[PDB]
Design a protein around this nucleic acid. Structure first.
Ligand code: 3IR
Lengths: 552, 409
DNA sequence: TATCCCCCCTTCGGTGCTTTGCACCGAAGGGGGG
């Protein structure tokens, strides 16, 4: 064994170690001495300190985890917040699509490496644990950890630091050997011949044994496929582990959440996954034991997802000698899919974007949100922003970014004709229309009464006022614009006294959470030319003062 | 010199900021630069026990090929206990605005000779991420004064004064003011002699302790008052929009009166009808136009407040901005126009406008402003690094409400 | 009644201000994989 250095660990200042007794347990689930404890004491992972360590921690045996293997899962829920904080240095999880074409691949596993990495001397006392012996009728003996506990707050960071320190000399001495080290896995690949690669693997094993870490051949995976973090590595292919979707005839909300989660997990390779109808059932919902009915849309969506998943699909590994191309498609209701690839019909990765940013948004903005996401994911996974192949027309994009009040950009894209193509349905007018009808719209509502009036006046003299109930001033403004749009012809000039409504319709939305806005968009797309203008309120400007008195 | 102990303000802990993802070339440049720095001993690798982290970005300054490291210090500067007030950052030359030429020099490399206080070393930690998360982030720690920290010039003040004393001795025709890592050198003399003299100043600094160059002209800077349209025949829509603009201006200038202008709009006419102005209307319009032409009265800088900068997109590559401490007491209203080669990149235009505005604000008042960017946070954080060149970073907030304003166009 | 990571999704009081509703957002929990 080698003397791998320990890391100094302390509690948070001004607060001391916990003392938590153990909940009542069962004789079947426990022992007079938890038989693994004595063996670990002999092995050196645990020592005995009885009189002068008046600290404790909850200890139990797990039956659900690892197929009732009875793992010694000691719970440190209190000491975790009682101890100092740590900065975990790894953020995400490696993706095979970021891997290269390596001729020889071997996966090494380090079993119980946490219990092999030593713990700091001072902090050993704070991890004291005791267990009752028989039916909680005997006290038992109090022990204390000598190595890294399983599930302690600093354990992952400390183990990663120790393991990268161990692996540093070997990586330095061999630059051609690639070694992915995530948590408790060790993917090792190379461009060497198979025999020489296995020889290097044996040198790696002997090096780790010199450092006290062993890689048992029980978990040492020799030949492909190599199960890696739930993926199936092949010489020229990768695939997620085969998925077993719930085929239950009845569907609870818990089962629906399981379905959508497994569908999201399968979405990174299977194209065309949609979960919007299965999440509209999740919003609001009900008690988890309530048998949730399935809408026709939801069941059609599930059938389509099943027919997608009934065939196998696979990705390909990265090749730095080529370029990355991503094509975006539109799936309606605010759903988008992309197929990042390098050569046609062999896609490195796949995914979906279905978020709704804002109560009022349209196709162009959501496509910009999709490209801006794909960008940051591609940066994370490859370090290069891909070339986009968008459905938006170049003229439409130019118009949008030149006339929009924000700063928007898309890195580099070529227009691809794949319907439904993103296009702007309606445009407003910059100059008043010659020979159009002018409407002065105003709506006044008292919040203390939850009533109000909405209507308009016109230069040609026609007037209208409708009473309102259970609506706010904003609503009244939107309804006033709605009446002005409805009662007018294909060309109309509307004067409004509401910056809120003027900004909402000016943002040029296509879909909204408000039926008022949806109806307004339908009227506007039906119309041919529409102009909007804003005047101050209570300014005595023309018939606006009169209509204000009418709707007050 | 000796290390001056640095402590935080009472009751609040050090920085904890995540690291934004970087591209392949930026990561490679960062790795090479940090390897060289560690070999020189300027940084030391650190373990997991440090719970502090600040983001680091890689940039490439203009007219160069070498990459340059840039570490975001915003949080640490905001947390540090008064190395801008208790230390020599207070005095700002009121005559810096009135100079024909203002040059910007780079003096950040001089800070790498003074070690930092050991009790404060733990706070200046940063992480270098890896592609695809392939390896844990290579953490580090500064062994010397860090570039971009507000207390770094505070520490180096005692040496910078000594270095610059002879230059002010033989040549007291230049006003000198440094903000963080940069030195603003301004001379009121002819531009031809100005460039040759900086070479001597650069030579003097070179031998005692780089070949780039910047140029500003603070004299040719004016506040932009708002102006009403000047038309002979006025339409109903044009009169309504003019009255709206005057109502906007009324919150700023109390002298504006729109009683007669509102009296002119008395019934319902079509938007395209022409309304001829009356005598009283013309008189009121002339008075209001003179009031608007007159520079704003009552605006005074207050050091107890903070500067807030608005930015509006006016279209066709033109932007406007306003620096103020109170929303109706604007200190400087300006305008930016798209430069050649950047007419098709809103992120690039806004990023260069931010640098121009902050440089002007530093030169004028000696306090960088709090930006209010008209952009999405996600796309800004994604693409603002590819175009940034300054070695300092302001604090910006985002806005998603439309401005709707033609008041500044 | 195990820890910590990425991810998806909906629900929430909390501030801007665009007012006292409304738009917007970050902090949690409910799942998926480690
Ligand atoms: O060890 C591991 N092996 C595996 N490879 C493939 C599938 S599971 C998992 C990464 C480990 C982990 C699990 C729970 C909590 C913390 C950490």
């Amino acid at each position: 064994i080698s003397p791998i250095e320990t890391v100094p660990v302390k509690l948070k200042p001004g607060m001391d170690g916990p003392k938590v007794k153990q909940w009542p347990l069962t004789e079947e689930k426990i022992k007079a001495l938890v038989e693994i404890c004595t063996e670990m004491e002999k092995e050196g992972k645990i020592s005995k300190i009885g009189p002068e360590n008046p600290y404790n921690t909850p200890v139990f045996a797990i039956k659900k985890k690892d197929s009732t293997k009875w793992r010694k899962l000691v719970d440190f829920r209190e000491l975790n917040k009682r101890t100092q904080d740590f900065w975990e240095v790894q953020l995400g999880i490696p993706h095979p699509a970021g891997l290269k074409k390596k001729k020889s691949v071997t996966v090494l596993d380090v079993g119980d490496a946490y219990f092999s990495v030593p713990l700091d001397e001072d902090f050993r006392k704070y991890t004291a644990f005791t267990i009752p012996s028989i039916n909680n009728e005997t006290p038992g003996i109090r022990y204390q950890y000598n190595v890294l506990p399983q599930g302690w707050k600093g354990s992952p960071a400390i183990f990663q630091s120790s393991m990268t320190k161990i692996l540093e000399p070997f990586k330095k001495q061999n630059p051609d050997i690639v070694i992915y080290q995530y948590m408790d896995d060790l993917y090792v690949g190379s461009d060497l011949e198979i025999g020489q690669h296995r020889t290097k693997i044996e040198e790696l094993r002997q090096h780790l044994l010199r450092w006290g870490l062993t890689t048992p051949d029980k978990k040492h995976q020799k030949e492909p496929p190599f199960l890696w973090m739930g993926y199936e590595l092949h010489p020229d292919k990768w695939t997620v582990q085969p998925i077993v979707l719930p085929e239950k005839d009845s569907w609870t909300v818990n089962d629906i959440q399981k379905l959508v989660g497994k569908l999201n997990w399968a979405s990174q390779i299977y194209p065309g996954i949609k979960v919007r109808q299965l999440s509209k059932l999740l919003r609001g919902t009900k008690a988890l034991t309530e048998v949730i009915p399935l809408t026709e849309e939801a069941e059609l969506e599930l059938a389509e997802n099943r027919e997608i998943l009934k065939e196998p699909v696979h990705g390909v590994y990265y090749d730095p000698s080529k370029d990355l191309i991503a094509e975006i498609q539109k799936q309606g209701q605010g759903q988008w899919t992309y197929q990042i690839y390098q050569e046609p019909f062999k896609n490195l990765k796949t995914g979906k974007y279905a978020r709704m940013r804002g109560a009022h948004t349209n196709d162009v903005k959501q496509l910009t949100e999709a490209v801006q996401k794909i960008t940051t994911e591609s940066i994370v996974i490859w370090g290069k922003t891909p070339k986009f192949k968008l459905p938006i027309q170049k003229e439409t994009w130019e118009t949008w970014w030149t006339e929009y009040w924000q700063a928007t950009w898309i890195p580099e894209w070529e227009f691809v004709n794949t319907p439904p193509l993103v296009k702007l349905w309606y445009q407003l007018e910059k100059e008043p229309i010659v020979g159009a009808e002018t409407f002065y719209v105003d709506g006044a509502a008292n919040r203390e009464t939850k009533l109000g009036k909405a209507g308009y006046v016109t230069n040609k003299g026609r007037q209208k006022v409708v009473p309102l109930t259970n609506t706010t001033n904003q609503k009244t403004e939107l309804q006033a614009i709605y009446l002005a749009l409805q009662d007018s012809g294909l060309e109309v000039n509307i004067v409004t006294n509401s910056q809120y409504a003027l900004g909402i319709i000016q943002a040029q939305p296509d879909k909204s959470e408000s039926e008022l806005v949806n109806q307004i968009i339908e009227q506007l797309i039906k119309k041919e030319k529409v102009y909007l203008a804003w005047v101050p309120a209570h300014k005595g400007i023309g018939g606006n003062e009169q209509v204000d008195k009418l709707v007050s | 010199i000796e290390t001056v102990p640095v402590k935080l303000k009472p009751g609040m802990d050090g920085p904890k900021v995540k690291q934004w993802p970087l591209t392949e070339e930026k990561i490679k440049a960062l790795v090479e630069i940090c390897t060289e720095m560690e070999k020189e001993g300027k940084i030391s690798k650190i373990g997991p026990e440090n719970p502090y982290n600040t983001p680091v970005f890689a940039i490439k300054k203009k007219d160069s090929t070498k990459w340059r490291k840039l570490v975001d210090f915003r949080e640490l500067n905001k947390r540090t206990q008064d190395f801008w007030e208790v230390q020599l950052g207070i005095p700002h030359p009121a005559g810096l605005k009135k100079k024909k030429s203002v040059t910007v020099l780079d003096v950040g490399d001089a800070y790498f000779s003074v070690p930092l206080d050991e009790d404060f070393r733990k706070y200046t930690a940063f992480t270098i991420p890896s592609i695809n998360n392939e390896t844990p982030g290579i953490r580090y720690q500064y062994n010397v004064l860090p570039q971009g920290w507000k207390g770094s010039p505070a520490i180096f003040q005692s040496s910078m004064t000594k270095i610059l004393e002879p230059f002010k001795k033989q040549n007291p025709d230049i006003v000198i003011y440094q903000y963080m890592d940069d030195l603003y050198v301004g001379s009121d003399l002819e531009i031809g002699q100005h460039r040759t003299k900086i070479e001597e100043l650069r030579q003097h600094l070179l031998r005692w302790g780089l070949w780039m160059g910047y140029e500003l002209h603070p004299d040719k800077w004016t506040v932009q008052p708002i102006v009403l349209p000047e038309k002979d025949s006025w339409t109903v829509n044009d009169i309504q929009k003019l009255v709206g603009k005057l109502n906007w201006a009324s919150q700023i200038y109390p002298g504006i009166k729109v009683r007669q202008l509102s009296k002119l709009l008395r019934g319902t006419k079509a938007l395209t009808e022409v309304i001829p102005l009356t005598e009283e209307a013309e008189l009121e319009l002339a008075e209001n136009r003179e009031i608007l032409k007159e520079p704003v009265h009552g605006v005074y800088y207050d050091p107890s407040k903070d500067l807030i900068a608005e930015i509006q997109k006016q279209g066709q590559g033109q932007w406007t901005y306003q620096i103020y401490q109170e929303p109706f007491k604007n200190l400087k209203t300006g305008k930016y126009a798209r430069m050649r080669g950047a007419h098709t990149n809103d992120v690039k235009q806004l990023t260069e406008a931010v640098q121009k505005i902050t440089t002007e604000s530093i030169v004028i008042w000696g306090k960088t402003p709090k930006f209010k960017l008209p952009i999405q946070k996600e796309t800004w954080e994604t693409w603002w690094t590819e175009y940034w060149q300054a070695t300092w970073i302001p604090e910006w907030e985002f806005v998603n409400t439309p401005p709707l304003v033609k008041l500044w166009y």
